[PDB]
Design a protein around this ligand. Structure first.
Ligand SMILES: O=C(O)CCC(=O)c1cccc2ccccc12
Ligand SMILES: O=C(O)CCC(=O)c1cccc2ccccc12
Ligand SMILES: O=C(O)CCC(=O)c1cccc2ccccc12
Ligand SMILES: [Mg+2]
Lengths: 337, 337, 337
């Protein structure tokens, strides 16, 4: 097991020990799943009720929660952010150290920093470029002239096409496909005719791309993902979308061709965006919303209906089908009075 | 071709022959696509009209349907369940018999039952564990310390991360990713900060996982899939979801972080569940529903609207935008009478 | 760089030069991103305002737009379709010329036209059949007795199962899975029992299949994709669906078991179709629509609600919950007058 003292861990997030710093810790855990060997935290004002009964060894707490506290504490401004920081010290994910696999193919035109690792059966086409301390997983395919900046981590079975440019510290889960040819077809008298896709992709720094997520290449200009953009799993980004820095998109979100999302935007799960619209900075879209027109006011937007028992849903739908009569009924009365 | 007598096939589901058991059969087919060489069935009271004209050789039938029947029958309590049983005898899917491929990599720390098969270019990291009569397809990646119980069938290009524990008789279609790092980020003054994902996955026995489906690893505790849980394709299960045994989820369903589904639940296609809610046992959610709050009453739940021609949809939406006036109009009249 | 004269390019789409045909061109570009080295076009009557200020070298234009035009033009009936045609001459996607990779496995029972290419670590099972001038990418898996007609292009990490038959000039982006076993289970007293999937797939000619798209094999008959059918990314086609020739489906669309779509149909993004319904020819379904019943009238169909600010959405939902009172209120008044 990986284990550390409260002192080593307090050091990492600059906390104050309020028991004994000598106490070993072997992993992290929620308030009411935590053992004596484990560090927890209170982030939610709500779970304030559940703190005393925790068998946690130690607890990341604001000075306020820590005050009159039965146990040993680690005191910090933001427990959750400290929790977030500490989480990496307990990550048991393997880290295949530097060098290529004999199996992995690499074109003679491909630069590949010595500090980087390429896993089994990998492939790397002509003009590729693997920046420093990058980690490329097994069965990954990098396409021609595609670029992963330093600190990148690509899980196995990730595919880049030709002409995909990525900043530093990229994180890409398995199954991801970047630079694919999206729907582009013209209608010649009711037959679809292939518009070839001759843009590429450009992705800034510190970007997460979740598993089985697809990002289409541009039609002419590049598909643009800004810096610190966090994309969950099963996401679809069409050709020529632009995403503002620090925008977060939850799972199963689909953005149509040429849509532009400003900065610090949050799209909840299974949001769709029609093509050729613009979303201004600081927009929250609630889950399974269909965004149909550009957004200029920052704030929160929804579509959908209240969940009901199916029977009540049928009565609602029917009450909705009779709105016309009700407005006819209501105009006949408007006359006589 | 694979072929069998009505007797061999009656044996397998303990049916009564009501023609001659000597009659060869070469495959199965629907009532009104069936040839003389083929066994059909009546499961639907509805298709009772379509039975006489069937050119089926033989028909799995309840005693009731079989009575006064022109053709040769196989009599059973449940034709459809008998149909289901017989279906496997006509499955032409290859079965790469035991042993590893020279190509496949296996770490020295990995146990791999002799009875199991590992296909071309496979990969198996340190501390892996391939139970007995498991079948691992080509380009599969098993991650470190991950465990497939006996009878497992993993199609090609399936990915397990580190620390994925799976019961017996697992069936996983291609493209599936289990143990991926889902969206977990804290907001440091408008920048997303990686919460590392240090849970794993635990999956019980007799579980189906469809193609390109993703199951996230836990943040701290494991992601939990109970026994006999049937997940269609393109599904997304976020970190720390719990699924009750015998729950079925149709394609394109997305379950957010920490949601709990009880047992014998049915989620129709493209249902979404917001995070941190609980669904009690025996809930049916109709297709493309957004479930926003916990469910305590067993039964059937919906959201969405009646499909209309687009023009009528526009008149509905407009009739809905004027509900406020209609309640103002209706309060002015409420006064004077 | 690839470069061509206006004359060579006018030749390809039979246009009339209305400056000098000697002028080299190095790529294509939108009206107001175009440099002097680049050919643009006016397809949209809307962007007619943006033509004069374009730094485009040359512009594909209808005679009408070209008339009194400051720059050098290429004159054609349909600029956009000419644009579509020309686009392929600037496609920088690599093209791994004929022959197999030493790495690639091929069964002795597999025919593989000499004109075709199979990339690194590919796999091709018994009874396969790679028609002429087909291109199979790295890590592709073709399953047993599956057939790609001539002119096919399969990106890397594409998976075919056993018994998948495909016409000519197929285009399949990465991550695609064709012939997977979809949800098929019977309920034996609340336990799901595997119905084996013993149909295959049949796909006509000139078909696009986008990335991470899944197409299920048939239960008994084949899954059917007609000719010139264009499927975007992240799409799910259940067992035994039928798609009419020239039907287009945008990204994240999900079609349930046994649904039939006629010809020249357009499904916008994230449309769902319930199983066992029929859609007649020439139907447009707007984005994120749930189609619940068969469609017989050609035209345009919708479900969903108008996007609102979340607050207004809450007032709408509440105004909708009080429709019953409003119809009670409206019946009490209907009495007294
Ligand atoms: O659920 C939360 O409350 C936050 C994350 C989120 O938006 C999400 C993730 C996955 C599937 C979903 C389905 C419906 C609504 C939301 C989601
Ligand atoms: O369609 C049925 O009636 C049963 C299976 C099912 O729920 C389904 C599967 C795939 C896509 C869907 C889209 C909308 C609604 C349902 C589905
Ligand atoms: O958006 C257009 O206007 C045309 C293409 C399209 O229908 C689309 C593509 C991807 C995601 C979507 C989400 C919602 C609505 C439409 C889409
Ligand atoms: Mg979806």
């Amino acid at each position: 097991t990986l284990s550390y003292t409260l002192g080593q861990l307090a050091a990492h997030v600059g906390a104050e020990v309020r028991g004994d710093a000598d106490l070993p810790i072997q992993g992290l855990a929620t308030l009411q799943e935590a053992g004596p060997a484990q560090l927890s935290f209170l982030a939610n004002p709500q779970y304030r009720k559940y703190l005393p009964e925790s068998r946690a060894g130690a607890v990341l707490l604001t000075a306020a929660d820590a005050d009159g506290f039965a146990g040993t504490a680690l005191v910090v401004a933001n427990p959750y952010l400290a929790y977030a920081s500490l989480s990496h010290l307990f990550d048991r994910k393997p880290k295949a150290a530097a060098g290529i696999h004999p199996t992995a193919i690499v074109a003679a035109d491909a630069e590949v920093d010595p500090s980087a690792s390429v896993g089994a059966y990998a492939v790397i086409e002509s003009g590729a470029r693997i920046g420093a301390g990058v980690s490329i997983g097994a069965h990954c395919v990098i396409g021609a002239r595609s670029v992963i900046g330093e600190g990148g981590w690509l899980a196995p079975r990730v595919t880049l096409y030709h002409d995909v440019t990525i900043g530093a510290r990229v994180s890409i889960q398995s199954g991801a496909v970047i630079g694919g040819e999206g729907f582009g077809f013209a209608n010649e008298k009711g037959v679809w005719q292939k518009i070839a896709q001759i843009g590429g992709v450009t992705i800034g720094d510190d970007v997460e791309i979740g598993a089985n997520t697809t990002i289409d290449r541009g039609a002419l200009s590049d598909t643009l993902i800004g810096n610190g953009v966090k994309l969950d799993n099963q996401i679809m980004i069409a050709h020529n979308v632009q995403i503002g820095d620090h925008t977060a998109m939850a799972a199963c979100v689909g953005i149509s061709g040429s849509a532009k999302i400003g900065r610090h935007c949050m799209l909840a799960g299974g949001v769709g965006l029609v093509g050729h619209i613009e979303i201004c900075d600081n927009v929250f879209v609630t889950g399974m919303t269909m965004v149909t027109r550009s957004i200029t006011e920052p704030g929160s937007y929804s579509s959908g209906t209240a969940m009901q028992p199916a029977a009540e849903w049928k009565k609602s739908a029917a009450r909705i089908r009779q709105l016309d009569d009700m407005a006819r009924r209501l105009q006949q009365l408007e006359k006589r009075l």
